[PDB]
A paper describes a structure:
This resolution was sufficient to build an atomic model in the 3D map by referencing the well-established nucleosome structure. We found that the local DNA structure at the 8-oxoG-containing SHL-5 site is virtually indistinguishable from the canonical nucleosome structure. Therefore, we conclude that 8-oxoG does not appreciably distort the local DNA structure even though the nucleosomal DNA is bent.
Human OGG1 contains an AlkA_N-like domain and a helix-hairpin-helix (HhH-GPD) motif55. Here we report cryo-EM structures of human OGG1 bound to a 35-bp long DNA containing an 8-oxoG within an unmethylated Cp-8-oxoG dinucleotide as well as to a nucleosome with an 8-oxoG at super-helical location (SHL)-5.
Author numbering:
A (entry chain G), B (entry chain C): 9 to 118
C (entry chain E): 38 to 134
D (entry chain A): 37 to 134
E (entry chain D), F (entry chain H): 27 to 121
G (entry chain F): 18 to 102
H (entry chain B): 18 to 101
The structure:
Amino acid sequence: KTRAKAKTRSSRAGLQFPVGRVHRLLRKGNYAERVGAGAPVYLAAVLEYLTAEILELAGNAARDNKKTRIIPRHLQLAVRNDEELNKLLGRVTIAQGGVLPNIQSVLLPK
Amino acid sequence: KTRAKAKTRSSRAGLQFPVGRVHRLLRKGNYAERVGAGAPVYLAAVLEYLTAEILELAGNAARDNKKTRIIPRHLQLAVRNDEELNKLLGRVTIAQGGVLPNIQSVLLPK
Amino acid sequence: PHRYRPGTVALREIRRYQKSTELLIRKLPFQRLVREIAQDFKTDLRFQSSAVMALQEASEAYLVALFEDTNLCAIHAKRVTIMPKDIQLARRIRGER
Amino acid sequence: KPHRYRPGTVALREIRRYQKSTELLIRKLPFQRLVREIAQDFKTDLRFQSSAVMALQEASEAYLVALFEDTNLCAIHAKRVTIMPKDIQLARRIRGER
Amino acid sequence: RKTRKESYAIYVYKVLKQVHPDTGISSKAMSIMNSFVNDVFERIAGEASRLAHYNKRSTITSREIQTAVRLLLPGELAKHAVSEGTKAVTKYTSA
Amino acid sequence: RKTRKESYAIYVYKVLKQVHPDTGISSKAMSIMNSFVNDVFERIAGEASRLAHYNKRSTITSREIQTAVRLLLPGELAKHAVSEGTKAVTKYTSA
Amino acid sequence: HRKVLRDNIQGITKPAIRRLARRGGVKRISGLIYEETRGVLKVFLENVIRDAVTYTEHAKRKTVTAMDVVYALKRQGRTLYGFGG
Amino acid sequence: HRKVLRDNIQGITKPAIRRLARRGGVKRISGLIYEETRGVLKVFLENVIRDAVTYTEHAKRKTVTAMDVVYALKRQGRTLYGFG
DNA sequence: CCGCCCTGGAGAATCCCGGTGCCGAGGCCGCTCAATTGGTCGTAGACAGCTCTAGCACCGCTTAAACGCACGTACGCGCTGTCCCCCGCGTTTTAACCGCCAAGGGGATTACTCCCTAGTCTCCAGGCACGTGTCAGATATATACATCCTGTGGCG
DNA sequence: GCCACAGGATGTATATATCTGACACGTGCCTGGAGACTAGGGAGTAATCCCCTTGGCGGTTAAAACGCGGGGGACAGCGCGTACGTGCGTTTAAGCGGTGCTAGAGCTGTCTACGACCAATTGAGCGGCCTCGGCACCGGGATTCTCCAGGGCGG
């Protein structure tokens, strides 16, 4: 049938994250009785920004490690070397991400 | 429309806490789409048991303090003296409750 | 002269303040501190007396717990004196710093 | 003359090696046996997913490494380089576990 | 004449009377008790919501509440709470 | 044929292509990223629901999400996330 | 009356910090403890008041309430009993 | 198929605890550290496994899944990334 | 004067590069389900008017507490030394791991069906709000009780 | 050159009286919980497919156990000099009480737009399957870290 062209709300808002999927996950998650029109757009934008920031830092870490693929070690290095990312993910353990190289000054051999 | 005499569900289940009020709070808290019939009864019974336990300990503390009225100091004494209540309320500050009287052994004189 | 030894009055104060239940910080100075801090967040703010008292109770409980942990660290280092390094170690282990 | 490294250089080398690496430091079969023995007390005839046991092992190792960092901080605070059961006890007590 | 603010004041007073027949409770202690009851209600109901979401259910049942109680309350508190909840539920279903 | 499951894998890959055109992602790292997206979604949605309930509202709006972001994310992360969200909502409303 | 307050952290006097340490069980206090305690208290208050003011601003109110303070503390995982419900 | 395991806490050997301490950044280790570490690990695993088995029993399943462990850790406030 | 101190190779571990190879990241395709279009409706929310509680501001006073300074004693910190416990390493024993195989218990799905919960209307009674009058509690005070600190008796 | 404590000196639990204010009780009233009913879909149940978990078996070798030497450091002892606790005289501003003002919290009544809902379309991404190179590994070589056996001039 002849209706308007199906333009996704992600493209309408200029995002790469699924506005419709975020809207469904907010509606079906039993968070409130109603979900606004701008709430999925705002939440998708925030999720996209955070994902972009962590991916940028992880790609920089992978490049510094002479590799072209992001691995859990690279994600851990990015998160624990960015101060605000470490603040946001302080109580989060990344699988097979290891720990940062941090040997105490007193333990250093002098 | 004189129907049958009403019976409170607290009296039907042998409880003091309000089963109907607990049911309404469960239904209006966005906790789930549907709420079972026995869920308010169980939750109200658990709340009444916890209230009775903490009130019994606080009344014992008040009696030991030679007073006939429970105050926040007595509530704090009861909670921090009962190991399980302390573990349940470990991330809780009781207003105007003070602290448990303890002095370290190395800080004691000799 | 009846000067007490250095620590008997301290122990007496410990017992007194652990027995009591009041607020150890002066209400007007603490309220002014809260208002000064809140100036930087939103100008022309009004605080309920209940709100100021809630902040004071929370702050005093936090500081008392931190001083308990600080005393634990100082005794671990085999000292009866608490030190800023004791405070820093307690906060670092708790995850605040 | 036989060669012998001084006490501390090999330990530092191990510290660097294990901080740079990211693999599990506990044998999988013994850890799985311990997990199953512990879970026996809670529900008999239990089965486990391999991913479940791996999650338990990774979480436990992360917890133990964090606890050892805090223990090292306590030992340094006490003017020592050796970690001790009292250091572990203080770390847990400050963190709220004891 | 203003909006009524509900509280568990009378229920906590009844429980106190049935436990200690000759004991009172000050206004501050009553407020702390109301906050404690609301806090435990929130804990248990949030845990029950998480359980219902995890099991892809859309209902909070006595089983969900009991599992939430076991998860939250430590040890003997969980055992006694489960026993009392079961007793109350059976006494309700009998009537 | 079994039930199909949803994930943010393709969206995270598209964002990675936008940011670093010559970088790839392993399966485990993609799973960790999906868990991270889910955790941030859960935190923000929970905080916004708390705000809606504590203001006696019944709608999750862009204002609720903005307040939740400002409460959860620290400092510059929160400031930049607020800017990105406001820009996205303005574009969505203009379109 | 438009007035500005400044440097009230010195309003938390040395005797007040001493009393807090005494309630904490501390028998002897170093002289540098007081400024460290003032800094810690200021950081804690800033963190709590930021969230309380955020809640108030969201509520389109100009009055910070005890319930807003309680919500901020609960956000920090420091549940406070006795200031509402 | 009834098998009862016992004294498996010794499977966490001294060199394994040394590797964990090295990863943590520890130079020297006292002799009594290993028993203390085994006890700490045992109590941690007991708590996490108890919560996981509670979730499993509520689900009416018989095998402890990875999501059960993840939810147990989340109940403990120890979010683990990479298992769903 | 003598231990104490300053140094370049030897051995081992780390780094560095090149060839091999694989399996896991990555593109691509039909296809079903979830997102998108488009009217409806009734309610959540926006807003203007209004009431009065409650927060802010100020004056005076009364004094409790904060401030400041002298003194000295207990304490943090540094130095030496003893020995003992942990580290480094070589050798032997152990079982973790890897590969493959089998089978069966249990996860996950799919109809279906009925009973359990949402939703409504009504009623009445349990519970909130509001007076109020007294009894538990704070306080002022004289205790006698409980606890700390130094000289005086005492000698080897 | 120390050991016990008697008694002074001071903090403090006890008993008595005297307000006093808020806590518990009663009572009118109102809105929300219970009774009774209908409607529909959520979950219980039963049968089935298959997958992945456990158990077994064998070979390899990586790791753990174990013993031994020795030296790094933990801990005790001792000393000393700064620094914090104790206490008393000054001061200041906190608490309280009282009055005044008004700003904003709370409520109420209309009214609007907006989001849930539902019918219908369609394309987006999950699943599954080829396909190639990024990274682990083995082989080989250069560099570097660390430690020990010679040269040296010091108050």
